[PDB]
Specification:
The complex is a heterodimer of chains A (300) and B (237).
Chain A (H helix, E strand, L loop, with lengths): L1 E4 L7 E5 L2 E5 L7 E5 L5 E7 L7 E5 L5 E7 L4 E7 L2 H13 L4 E2 L8 H5 L5 H7 L8 E4 L5 H5 L25 H6 L2 H13 L2 H18 L2 H15 L6 H17 L5 H4 L2 H10 L7 H10 L5
Parallel strand pairs in A: 4-9
Antiparallel strand pairs in A: 1-4, 2-3, 2-5, 5-6, 6-10, 7-8
Helix pairs in contact in A: 7-8, 7-9, 8-11, 9-12
Chain B lengths: L16 E5 L5 E6 L5 E6 L1 E6 L5 E7 L10 H19 L8 E4 L5 H7 L7 E3 L14 H9 L4 E6 L10 H17 L1 H9 L17 H23 L2
Helix pairs in contact in B: 1-2, 4-5, 4-6, 5-6
The complex binds N-[(2-methoxyphenyl)methyl]urea.
């Protein structure tokens, strides 16, 4: 179990750690989050009390370094940093633990939510979508745009998601225009799976990372990416059976975890109705269809 | 974006454009079978591709062989149309290729966009106008060439005959749309109007009769009467 200590909490802030959130008051004696499970990526995220504009946070894996948070009063945000002096870090974390100035990751012994939301997400891939190589962790916020969005303006602060575009030459073989547009199996399996992602795990990892950025930061381009990646599978007549089965499990926990009151902006009526009721895979997403219909029947 | 009443005069500027209509591409007669079920039999069709500024018509005849062994013909027809328009554009010299292609039905937008991905600079546009190009098979010489065709064939016409010698494209297109709208509302009356006078003939190289200017004004008036009429006869007004 790992720890992200905080130097202090100078400004009133709602802190989020995975699907968990807590309230920290201005200058409350707060020094971090302990008992973070090893073996998964994590996201620590922030919404200031005074300006709910800009949710923001950091994707990190404790196996890759000792990380802490320190408010910066100049840039006005909680910044993640790496401590290279390991002895200094252990000493700091132990003191804060002894003084019980760290809140606890409440991981229940029946709860597999985070695992099922991050199953194929890897930090190495996150760091290639979020390009900032000098840090082992990755900053994301509400306002960052995607590469594709920038095509349709700062490239250093972009989300370099894989560009998916159904009316592109990449997506449509010359001479198979109607075939390839109505049955995207070529684009899914040859262009994307075999060509770009190399395997289904990487494809699912970006999909899951796109959803989480959509959910935690309300990042709109992430939501676009998440829906495009779903649609490209649902609109493919030929998809490996294991991908379909895993997809259903993936979407199930995403729909399960979405806040009830955010469904209206995070869920695209057209893609979901198409995917669940018109597409080739309309009958292959049993779990996902059942929870969608029992929880958000309005969108459908 | 969409072509409508407010940007109507863009049709007659000097940027090359084509209207495409796919209404007559896939055509069937519906009949009973010996067992009393219903079946369709396709008849020859055509793509109606028209430069509204010049009158040039690119009549691509769709022979019923193109449907043999195919499923979902109404959907295929939209893509067959897009394949043929794309081939037409590629066949033309660069300085003759259109800058815009306006489709008369929105279901052609995606088929044509995909077939034209090689031509990113050609705008594929819908329209809100209800254009009467479906009535193009009411023009005898056009229907005749479609029905006689034994293989795929492109035939080239000027749908304005020689009108541009005496009137502007805007007027030539108003006349064409009025003739076609009449032929669509009541083909028999329309054709009656157009032929009633045996001294006014259609030249071998033309589609419509050789009316003088004065005679076109009478004809045009008679076509508007017919259109207002059938509208009453329809709505009882
Ligand atoms: C680390 O999660 C916490 C920290 C401090 C107080 C409460 C929680 C748990 N929140 C939650 N939503 O379950």
């Amino acid at each position: 179990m790992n720890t992200v200590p905080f130097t202090s909490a100078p400004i009133e802030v709602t802190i989020g750690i995975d699907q968990y959130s807590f309230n920290v008051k201005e200058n409350q004696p707060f020094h971090g989050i302990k008992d973070i499970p090893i073996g998964h990526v994590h996201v620590i995220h922030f919404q200031h009390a005074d300006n709910s504009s800009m949710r923001y946070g950091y994707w990190f894996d404790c196996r890759m370094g000792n990380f802490y948070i320190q408010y910066d009063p100049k840039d006005g945000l909680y910044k993640m940093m790496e401590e290279r002096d390991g002895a200094k870090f252990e000493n700091i974390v132990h003191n804060f633990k002894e003084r019980q100035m760290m809140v606890s990751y409440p991981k229940i012994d029946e709860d597999d939510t985070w695992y099922n939301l991050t199953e194929f997400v890897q930090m190495d891939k996150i760091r290639k979508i979020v390009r900032k190589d000098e840090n082992q962790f990755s900053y994301v916020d509400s306002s960052m745009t995607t590469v594709q969005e920038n095509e349709l303006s700062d490239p250093a602060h972009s989300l370099n998601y894989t560009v998916i575009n159904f009316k592109s030459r990449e997506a449509i073989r010359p001479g198979h225009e109607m075939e390839d547009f109505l049955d995207k199996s070529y684009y899914l399996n040859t262009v994307m799976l075999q060509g770009i992602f190399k395997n289904s795990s990487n494809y699912f990892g970006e999909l899951q990372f796109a959803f989480l950025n959509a959910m935690f930061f309300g990042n709109y381009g992430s939501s676009l990416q998440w829906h495009a990646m779903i649609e490209l599978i649902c609109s493919s007549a030929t998809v490996p059976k294991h991908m379909l089965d895993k997809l259903d499990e993936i979407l199930y926990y995403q729909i399960k975890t979405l806040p009830e009151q955010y469904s209206d902006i995070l869920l695209n009526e057209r893609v979901w109705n198409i995917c669940l009721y018109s597409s080739f895979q309309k009958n292959s997403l049993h779990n996902t269809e059942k929870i969608m219909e029992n929880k958000y029947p309005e969108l459908l | 974006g969409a072509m409508n009443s407010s940007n109507y005069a863009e049709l007659f500027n000097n940027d090359i454009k084509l209207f495409v209509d796919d209404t007559n591409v896939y055509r069937v007669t519906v009949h009973k079978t010996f067992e009393g079920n219903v079946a369709t039999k396709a008849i020859n069709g055509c793509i109606f591709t028209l430069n509204p500024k010049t009158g040039h018509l690119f009549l691509k005849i769709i022979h019923t062989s193109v449907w043999a062994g195919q499923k979902r013909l109404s959907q295929l027809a939209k893509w067959k149309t897009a394949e043929e328009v794309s081939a037409l554009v590629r066949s033309l010299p660069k300085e003759e290729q259109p800058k815009q292609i306006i489709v008369t039905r929105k279901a052609m937008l995606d088929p044509l966009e995909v077939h034209m991905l090689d031509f990113p600079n050609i705008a594929i546009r819908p329209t809100e106008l209800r254009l009467p190009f479906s009535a193009a098979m009411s023009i005898d010489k056009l229907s005749d060439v479609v029905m006689k065709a034994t293989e795929p064939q492109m035939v080239l016409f000027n749908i304005y005959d020689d009108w541009l010698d005496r009137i502007s494209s805007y007027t030539a297109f108003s006349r064409l749309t009025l003739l076609l709208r009449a032929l669509k509302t009541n083909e028999e009356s329309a054709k009656m109007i157009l032929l009633s006078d045996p001294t006014i003939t259609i030249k071998s190289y033309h589609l419509w009769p050789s009316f003088t200017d004065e005679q076109w004004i009478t004809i045009e008036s008679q076509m508007r009467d017919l259109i207002l009429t059938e509208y009453g006869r329809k709505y009882n007004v």
